[PDB]
Amino acid sequence: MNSVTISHAPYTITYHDDWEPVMSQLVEFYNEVASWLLRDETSPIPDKFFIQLKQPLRNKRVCVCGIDPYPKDGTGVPFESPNFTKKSIKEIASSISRLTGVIDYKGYNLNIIDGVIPWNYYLSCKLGETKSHAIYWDKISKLLLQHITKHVSVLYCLGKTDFSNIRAKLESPVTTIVGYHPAARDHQFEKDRSFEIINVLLELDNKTPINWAQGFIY
């Protein structure tokens, strides 16, 4: 519940204690880039890059990670839509509906489910482009993904080419399965049912599984 002051925008980061031991060094990896980030307009606003830091890390088991936020109307927290318009959230909601069997749904937030963390590798992107801020966020992604790995048991990566070199990405060998492209040709995402593979992997290390039906909003 503490806070840290920054030279550049948003001038202040509020956070949870679970990021404490490493986030300190974060400041001398943020002041060297924030000058060039603010030159161009970004999605989301400068006040919501670090709102994902609120969620604690002492009760999370499996991680879902993206490559880049939505170019338009991003609200900091990933893989969500207040108006439920985006294609990827529709696809994952349909997959979860087919797996669980529930046929009605109008909202689906990955933040509601316990034991999971909705994450993105790059924390910014200018509208009209994709993964255009890799050089600005490379070391931050290093630090944050490695710190997440210290607690999470299973890692799920969405994307084929974006996550093709995750083996050298981290230093601690943890189980990691890569998903398929959200816009892959032939609708390969429709045949994807990786969630029960995630669950059965979480079976083998003797941990409590996760139920996805609570994440649906009716």
Binding site: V22, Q25, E28, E32, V33, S35, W36, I135, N165, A168
Partner: protein, 990 residues
């Protein structure tokens, strides 16, 4: 239309092709585009059972398939190999499919293209215009490479183009970063097709306040304000950072043939691209020859350590000498300065003396032929010269003679007649010069950067990378951009496939292979006598040829877990499998319960691996013989490159026979090869040890008998020699391994040593060895101290040398660059090694006296140094890089940095290189037991001064010093006694 190939490369779009870059006689560049397919080998029955017909099928013909799986037998009833003779077809298709019964599924498609079409990767070809269709400017399309590349013409000479670049950025405390540190200087060496060589350097003007621009322009430099108004003829150009980056982008986009940079893939090119994108929204674009695919620069990684590569697709080869040096040669250090020092060196003479500078002369009549020319060529841009590996000199004046060079160097007068000169480290502080930036400093850094750029050219010409690339492409059957990118398991597939196709055999592994699982110590370290070196001529290839060890020639493996069955099995083997048709080799058992394992190999028909090794050896011998009588320098370089390539490829077979995923994997073959090699080295070491040479006779300590089976050779140990009868020599054997053997002789006359070495080599080759095992004389070692072949120091005399010749001071294992011990430590180690070498050569030594000498020398020096306390602090000054990537709980180094930061206005970032030492209050006297030493660590700033109530904790430094000393020497018990008496601890020997 005659062209010579340069490179072959891939397109990675939705439709993929094969690209060939070639040059004609006049200088024109031609690109050819082929369709690239997926290849498959099938049998006739599967070929006729393919409901969708393949795109095209080619009948390979009769082929014989052999199962090469290995089974363990516990008896003497051995099931024979399963061999199947059938018709086989080779099919080509655009798209990838799965075939359930496809063989030869380990060879690449590019190799299939080369072999099936009969195209050498670098041959000169007279193409036919009938099968070529013009699709663009300079790019043609060919769909039938079988007939287009039919004509073969002899090799001719073609021009080439090169670009070498160097970068100099701004830094003050830490490693440069893109966001805060700009680029100051950028130097280029440029070679076009016309053969003219240009050198230029661009300096940014953002740091050279306007008076300095005006002074530089008045001095002769040129200023530009736009991209289009800069000329390569001018040697120095002053511009802005944006214009500099734009010029860099323009230069890197040209269709060169080689862009060579030392560690440029990790730092230089990446910095240029990132800075260019950061300053302006502009990219560097590479375009395909047919102009339908564009890519951006994005350096990507590979694991082999970590290697970096460029994703270009225009045909240019981006080369990094760092990776090539790491793969090709094993060295102590990989610094550019160290590589330059080891590469360029000469024997120079003193021509003048006095004052603070002296004149050095060098010519072909002093050192060798061509060394002085190389030094003179490097000298054209050189600035600092290293002499005696201790003195760094700033060049004042230089000139190049017709067959040599002359320099004047500022150094203290030192009275001898001949020294050695080399190009090495420069005592230049870039960070200091960046703090007070002026015009003179800018010009000096400009010439430093241009020398760095030309150093890549000098190294490239020195290593012969172009001819090596051509030879590797020709032999390995691979594109020129792929020769130095993969391991041994990938370069062996081409010649292996060619051999399999010509001998029409297929090897099949049909079972999931199991997960199956030595250093030699010299008798004594110090010698004080002459050591003759003999070299085995490719021991593993010849032993594989002699034993016919191949996966398909293995009759079987017999195991036994008890001696009764072992004895009956030996009886049955001698009754059923007798020499010379079969050979039986013992191996160490592969399972804990088994006590004996015997592998049987047939010799009726030559195998596959022995044929490959014999071909490689014969080709290397032919190329050496052809090189010996060659006259032209170009032909000599080509032949040397070819023989080097054959030597490299022929020495990778033994490692591949033990690699599980390799194409030549065989457990029993590798074990048998190792066993026979060890048996041979043991036999030679046993027969040489104790040999005597008296009167006109030479006697060996054991019978000259074949250690495998009886032979018709005479086995009389006494051999008549041709040496004078007055000699009385006794020989001993000390060290021996796979590659070489050492023989000790008690004399210091080197002429007698070399003549006896030649005679003994002749006698061993003619009389002792057998079949195709040979040894050759290498050198004579004087004052040899060794722990192993990794770490030793001695004076080397070549075989073709006389007594009045300059020795080679060979010294390796030690680093002299491992930068966390001390400054006193390294210097005093050098002094002690020199002292050891100087009393080693007296002669009247024996063994347990020089240990005492060194022990009391250490005692006296340590007492004097501890008592006087006269050494300055900086001689005990240590370094460490600071980073927060520390595991565990505390790691008190971070805490120490914290109190230093909170106690001092100076602040250390997370990328600095901070200096530390060991300090203790002066009241403590000399201690015996040691404690946790991290508590004694202190950080030293620039303004820190040693206070009167503390002092340097000498004990750790002296303990490390005496530990490395006691790692040397021969005596044992007195060493632990001394170490106990001084420090009360157990030394860690070896």
């Amino acid at each position: 239309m005659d062209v010579r190939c340069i490179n072959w490369f891939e397109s990675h779009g939705e439709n993929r092709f094969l690209y060939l870059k070639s040059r004609c006689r006049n200088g024109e560049t031609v690109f050819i585009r082929f369709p690239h397919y997926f290849y498959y080998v099938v049998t006739d029955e599967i070929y006729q059972s393919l409901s969708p017909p393949p795109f095209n099928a080619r009948p390979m013909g009769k082929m014989r398939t052999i199962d090469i799986d290995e089974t363990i037998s516990y008896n003497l009833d051995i099931k024979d190999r399963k061999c199947s003779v059938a018709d086989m077809w080779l099919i080509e298709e655009p798209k990838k499919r799965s075939i359930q019964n496809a063989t030869m599924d380990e060879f690449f498609n590019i190799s299939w293209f080369y072999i099936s079409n009969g195209i050498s990767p670098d041959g000169c070809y007279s193409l036919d215009e009938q099968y070529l269709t013009k699709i663009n400017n300079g790019c043609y399309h060919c769909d039938d490479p079988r007939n287009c590349f039919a004509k073969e013409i002899p090799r001719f000479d073609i021009p080439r183009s090169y670009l070498f670049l160097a970068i100099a950025c701004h830094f003050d405390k830490k490693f440069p970063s893109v966001f805060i540190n700009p680029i100051s200087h950028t130097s280029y060496c440029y070679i076009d097709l016309s053969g003219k060589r240009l050198l230029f350097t661009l300096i940014n003007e953002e740091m050279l306040t306007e008076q300095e621009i005006q002074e530089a322009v008045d001095r002769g430099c040129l200023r530009i304000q736009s991209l289009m108004e800069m000329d390569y003829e001018r040697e120095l150009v002053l511009c802005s950072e944006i214009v500099l980056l734009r010029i860099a982008k323009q230069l890197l986009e040209l269709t060169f043939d080689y862009v060579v940079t030392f560690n440029g893939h990790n730092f230089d090119l990446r910095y240029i691209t990132n800075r260019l994108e950061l300053l302006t929204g502009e990219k560097i674009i590479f375009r395909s020859p047919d102009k339908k695919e564009a890519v951006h620069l994005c350096i990507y990684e590979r694991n082999q350590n970590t290697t970096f590569h460029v994703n270009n697709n225009n045909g240019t080869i981006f080369f990094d000498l760092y990776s090539f040096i790491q793969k090709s040669e094993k060295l102590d250090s990989y610094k550019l300065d160290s590589i330059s020092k080891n590469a360029f060196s000469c024997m120079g003479k003193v021509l003048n003396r006095g004052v603070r500078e002296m004149t050095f002369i060098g010519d072909d009549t002093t050192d060798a032929k061509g060394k002085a020319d190389t030094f003179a060529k490097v000298l054209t841009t050189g600035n600092y010269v290293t002499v005696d590996e201790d003195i760094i000199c700033k060049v004042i004046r230089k000139d190049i003679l017709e067959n040599g060079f002359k320099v004047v160097l500022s150094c203290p007068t030192l009275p001898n007649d001949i020294y050695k000169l080399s190009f090495g480290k420069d005592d230049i502080d870039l960070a200091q010069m960046y703090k007070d930036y002026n015009l003179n400093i800018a010009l000096d850094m400009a010439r430093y950067c241009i020398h760095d750029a030309c150093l890549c050219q000098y190294l490239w010409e020195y290593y012969g990378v172009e001819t090596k690339t051509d030879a590797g492409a020709a032999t390995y059957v691979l594109p020129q951009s792929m020769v130095f990118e993969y391991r041994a398991s990938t370069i062996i597939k081409g010649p292996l496939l060619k051999l399999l196709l010509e001998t029409k055999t297929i090897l099949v592994r049909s079972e999931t292979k199991q997960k199956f699982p030595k250093v030699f110590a010299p008798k004594q370290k110090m010698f004080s006598n002459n050591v003759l070196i003999f070299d085995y001529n490719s021991l593993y290839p010849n032993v594989c040829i002699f034993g016919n060890l191949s996966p398909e020639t293995l009759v079987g493996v017999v195991v036994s877990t008890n001696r009764l069955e072992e004895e009956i099995n030996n009886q049955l083997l001698l009754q059923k499998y007798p020499p010379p048709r079969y050979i039986t080799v013992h191996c160490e058992p592969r399972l804990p319960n088994l006590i004996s394992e015997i592998a049987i190999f047939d010799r009726s028909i030559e195998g596959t691996i022995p044929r490959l090794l014999r071909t490689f050896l014969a080709e290397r011998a032919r190329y050496k013989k052809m090189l010996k009588q060659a006259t032209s320098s170009t032909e000599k370089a080509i032949y040397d490159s070819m023989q080097y390539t054959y030597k490299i490829v022929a020495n990778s077979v033994y490692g591949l026979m033990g690699f599980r995923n390799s194409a030549l994997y065989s457990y029993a073959s590798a074990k048998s090869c190792t066993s026979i090699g060890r048996r041979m080295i043991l036999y030679l070491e046993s027969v040489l040890n104790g040999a005597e040479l008296s009167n006109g006779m030479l006697r060996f300590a054991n019978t000259l008998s074949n250690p495998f089976y009886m032979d018709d050779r005479d086995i009389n140990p006494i051999v008549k020699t041709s040496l004078p009868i007055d000699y009385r020599f006794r020989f001993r054997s000390v060290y021996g391994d796979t590659d070489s053997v050492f023989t000790e002789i008690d004399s210091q006359d080197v002429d007698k040593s070399i003549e006896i070495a030649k005679e003994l080599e002749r006698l061993i080759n003619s009389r002792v060895l057998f079949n195709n095992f040979k040894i050759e004389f290498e050198a004579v070692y004087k004052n040899l101290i060794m722990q192993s072949k990794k770490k030793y120091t001695t004076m080397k005399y070549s075989a073709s040398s006389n007594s009045k010749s300059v020795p080679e001071r060979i010294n390796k294992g030690t680093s002299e660059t491992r930068r966390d011990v001390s400054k006193f430590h390294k210097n005093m180690i050098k002094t002690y090694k020199t002292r050891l070498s100087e009393m080693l050569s007296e002669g009247r030594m024996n063994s347990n006296q020089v240990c005492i000498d060194i022990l009391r020398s250490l005692e006296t020096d340590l007492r004097s140094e501890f008592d006087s306390r006269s050494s300055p602090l900086e001689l005990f000054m240590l370094s460490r890089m600071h980073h927060s990537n520390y595991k565990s709980a505390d790691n008190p180094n971070m805490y120490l940095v914290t109190e230093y930061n909170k106690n001092n206005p100076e602040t250390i970032e997370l990328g600095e290189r901070y200096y530390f030492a060991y300090i203790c209050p002066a009241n403590v006297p000399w201690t015996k037991k040691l404690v946790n030493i991290k508590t004694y660590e202190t950080i030293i700033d620039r303004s820190f001064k040693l206070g009167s109530n503390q002092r340097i904790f000498y004990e750790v430094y002296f303990k490390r010093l005496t530990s490395e000393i006691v790692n040397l020497l021969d005596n044992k018990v007195l060493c632990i006694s001394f170490f106990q008496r001084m420090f009360g601890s157990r030394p860690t020997f070896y």
